[PDB]
């Protein structure tokens, strides 16, 4: 069955008509009171040249400059990378691989980087001559999906009754901990069968069911479809839409609304097919702290405490990897 995942046009978000952007809020609250996902279309940003520089970033790449990117999980000599670089595939075992990177910003200078705080690492990119132009496009898109992820902030706040920078403000290009990642799930002929996950249902997935470790997520994917929902009715197939923003709300969402916006839970298919996978997790500064709120509640109180962004994050990313493995 298919999940219910409406067109939602943001487009007011980035101007100044506010009547029309609370009728974007309010499609946004009925999506995310829902299955919990919606397509952001008109939102501005060139998907297909997006799409086309990271199949040459994923195409050239060669083993050794993966070994010279890879994280720590691959690479001891490179204690400093939990999150950003090279994610490797293992040949008949493990068939995405992926890459990711942080906040341009986060420069040797930068003070978080040298108070070494936890989630905050310098990128690492390959070689400009073998790939000429990469990091320059890598890092006009983070810039080009965080104005995308901050008009959609406006909107999730107003949803929630909030003036429009209620979220906004705490997502800042000189400190935000969002990541974008470039992952590759390949087509494979023969597929290794200890890459295919098989869930209770009898589903062949390649990722297990999770939560997302972000406030909210803005992902592009090929026009291959892979994604699931978990409903009361039951896991719903998420359709594809190669020119449009999928988005969704991360646990952070879920706690500081006191789960009136949960965060879904939701699967990936497995598919033998070469495709896109290109998310960006949309997470707040270290230090950021949103005091939870109820809107079912008359005067809004929550019991549940509040948590800074950094401790979530930390928390919450080796998490993910204990229950579904290192990507
Ligand atoms: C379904 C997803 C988009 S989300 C799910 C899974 N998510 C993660 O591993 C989180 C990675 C966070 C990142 N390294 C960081 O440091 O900020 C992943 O990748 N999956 C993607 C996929 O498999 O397509
Ligand atoms: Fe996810």
Redesign the pocket.
């Given at each position: 069955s298919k999940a219910n995942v409406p067109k939602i046009d943001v487009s007011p978000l980035f101007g100044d008509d506010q009547a029309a952007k609370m009728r974007v809020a309010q499609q946004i609250d009925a999506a995310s009171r829902d299955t919990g996902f919606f397509y952001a279309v008109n939102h501005g940003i060139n998907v297909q040249r997006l799409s086309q520089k990271t199949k040459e970033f994923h195409m050239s790449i060669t083993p050794e400059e993966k070994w010279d990117l890879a994280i720590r999980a691959y690479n001891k000599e490179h204690q400093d990378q939990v999150?950003a670089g090279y994610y490797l595939s293992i040949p008949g075992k493990k068939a995405?691989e992926?890459f990711?990177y942080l906040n341009p910003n986060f420069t040797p200078d930068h003070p978080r980087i040298q108070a070494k705080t936890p989630t905050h690492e310098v990128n690492v990119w390959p070689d400009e001559t073998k790939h000429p132009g990469f990091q320059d496009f890598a890092e006009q898109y983070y810039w080009d999906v965080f104005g995308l992820s901050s008009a959609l902030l406006k909107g999730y706040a107003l949803a929630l009754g909030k003036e429009e920078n209620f979220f906004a403000r705490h997502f800042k290009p000189d400190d935000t901990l969002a990541?974008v990642?470039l992952?590759r799930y390949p087509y494979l002929d023969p597929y290794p069968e200890a890459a295919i996950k098989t869930a209770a249902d009898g589903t062949k997935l390649?990722?297990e069911w999770?939560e997302?470790?972000s406030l909210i997520?803005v992902?592009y994917?090929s026009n291959v479809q892979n994604?699931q929902v978990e409903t009361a009715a039951g896991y719903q197939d998420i359709e594809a839409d190669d020119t449009g923003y999928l988005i969704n709300c991360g646990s952070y969402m879920a706690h500081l609304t006191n789960n009136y916006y949960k965060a879904p839970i939701?699967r990936?298919k497995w598919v033998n097919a070469e495709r896109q996978?290109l998310?960006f997790?949309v997470?707040l500064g270290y230090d950021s702290v949103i005091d939870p709120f109820d809107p079912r509640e008359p005067n809004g109180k929550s019991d549940r405490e509040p948590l800074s962004y950094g401790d979530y994050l930390q928390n919450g990313?080796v998490s993910?990897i204990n229950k579904n493995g290192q990507?």
């Open positions: 999150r995405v992926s990711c990541s990642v992952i390649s990722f999770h997302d470790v997520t992902l994917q994604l939701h990936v996978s998310p997790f997470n990313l993910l990507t």
